[PDB]
């Protein structure tokens, strides 16, 4: 089989930038080298096929070019609806081969996260469960920490953390951190902190509930 | 406009076995090659299998992993796609769509390449056994603002495909639902909405939970 092997599997532009993404093929390929894109729902569709034909409906600043092995797809202004990962596929021979994708990230302004705690459910009490969730909302960049504190005291076991994709609309991600803890550890604490740290402040975003 | 809607989808032991079905509209689908390509979940694109038009004797072919396994076929005069699915494994658990290949080569090139697709349907290979989610609310603990946030946490499931809407999807653009994690055994995940705060609690918020695999709806209403 033919591999096909994409420049990186991440980058990160600002709207208006010009984007260039790579492919190359281990055998020559004779110009049947195809592009694709996948949203971050999943939806598929086709961009450029023959090396530079643009499928007729798509947007002119896609376009294509390159030969042999070595292939490219350009995006010439960077447009909020980009936000995807980029697929190229080669069509000489069987089998039809895919490189591993490129994830494209927009990069927008500074943002800092909103905080919310929520205690767990009374129906879940019931249950014999206690998980303690907090969610870290439309922030950007990135990279933030998230600490939780009981009574005071760090802890660190039972944490799960979990990253949204880039949101399509406004290029902020979230995240949900979720403390799971048995009911009966539950029950010998009283103050439950979720601590947020971000670039876009010096001070932690802090949230709190006792449980009275 | 081209539709391909895949299904038959679902939890199937390894060593089972499983049919996949593909109804197209919008297009003579008799002319065409058509494709299954599959993606493993966080994974690539990876192409499954191909059936030609009649008039190349419906030839097939297969991907290295899956030829011997795999049996692809289609049914002209209703234009449905079939993928039969043999002695699977761990493996070939994956987002399959239907896919139709480009049309004539003398306008679009002899090189193979694939101009609709399906949104896709979820193949899970695993021993472990379906069970729905236990839904609880998540309803603030404290003092309100301008906006309010609320949420549903999805807990104790398997396999992996629930549904979060909001007041049946009429509650749309500040939702954020959070890609569920393996606890292991079983999947978790939550959703979240952010309303603004005379919305609630005086209108009703409720966030439906629907898992096929055990079909299984949930509704939970948000107390204060």
């Known amino acids: 089989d033919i591999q096909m092997t994409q420049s990186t599997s991440s980058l990160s532009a600002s709207l208006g930038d010009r984007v260039t993404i790579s492919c190359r093929a281990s055998?020559?390929?004779?110009?049947?080298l195809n592009w694709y894109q996948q949203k971050p729902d999943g939806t598929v569709k086709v961009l450029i096929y023959y090396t530079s034909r643009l499928r007729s409906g798509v947007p002119s600043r896609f376009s294509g070019s390159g030969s042999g092995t070595d292939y490219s797809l350009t995006i010439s202004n960077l447009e909020q609806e980009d936000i995807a990962t980029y697929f190229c596929?080669?069509?000489?021979?069987?089998?039809?081969?895919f490189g591993g994708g490129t994830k494209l990230e927009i990069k927008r302004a500074d943002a800092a996260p909103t905080v919310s705690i929520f205690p767990p459910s009374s129906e879940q009490l019931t249950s014999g469960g206690a998980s303690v969730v907090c969610f870290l909302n439309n922030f950007y960049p990135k990279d933030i920490n998230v600490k939780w504190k009981i009574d005071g005291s760090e802890r660190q076991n039972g944490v799960l953390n979990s990253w949204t994709d880039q949101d399509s609309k406004d290029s902020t991600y979230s995240m949900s951190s979720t403390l799971t803890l048995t009911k009966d550890e539950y029950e010998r604490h009283n103050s439950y902190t979720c601590e947020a740290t971000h670039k876009t402040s010096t001070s932690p975003i802090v949230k709190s509930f006792n449980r009275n | 406009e081209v539709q391909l809607v895949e299904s038959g989808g679902g939890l199937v032991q390894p060593k089972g076995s499983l049919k996949l079905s593909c109804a197209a509209s919008?297009?003579?689908?008799?002319?065409?090659?058509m494709n299954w390509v599959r993606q493993a979940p966080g994974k690539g694109l990876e192409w499954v299998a191909r059936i030609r038009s009649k008039s190349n004797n419906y030839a097939t072919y297969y991907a290295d992993s899956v030829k011997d396994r795999f049996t692809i076929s289609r049914d002209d005069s209703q234009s449905m796609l079939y993928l039969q699915m043999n002695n699977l494994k761990t493996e070939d658990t994956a987002m399959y769509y239907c896919?139709?290949?480009?049309?004539?080569?003398?306008?679009?090139?002899?090189?193979?390449?694939?101009?609709?697709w399906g949104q896709g349907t979820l193949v899970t290979v695993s021993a472990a056994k379906t069970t729905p989610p236990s839904v609880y609310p998540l309803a603030p603990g404290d003092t309100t603002g301008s906006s309010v946030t609320s949420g549903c946490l999805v807990k104790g499931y398997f396999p992996e495909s629930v549904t979060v809407t909001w007041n049946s999807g009429s509650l749309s653009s500040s939702v954020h639902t959070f890609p569920a994690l393996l606890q292991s055994g079983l999947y978790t995940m939550s959703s979240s909405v952010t309303v603004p705060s005379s919305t609630w609690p005086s209108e009703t918020v409720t966030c439906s939970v629907a898992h096929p695999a055990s079909s299984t709806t949930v509704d939970k209403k948000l107390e204060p």
């Open positions: 896919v139709r290949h480009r049309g004539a080569p003398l306008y679009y090139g002899n090189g193979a390449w694939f101009a609709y």
């Open positions: 055998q020559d390929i004779s110009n049947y």
């Open positions: 596929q080669q069509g000489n021979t069987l089998p039809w081969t």
């Open positions: 919008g297009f003579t689908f008799n002319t065409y090659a």
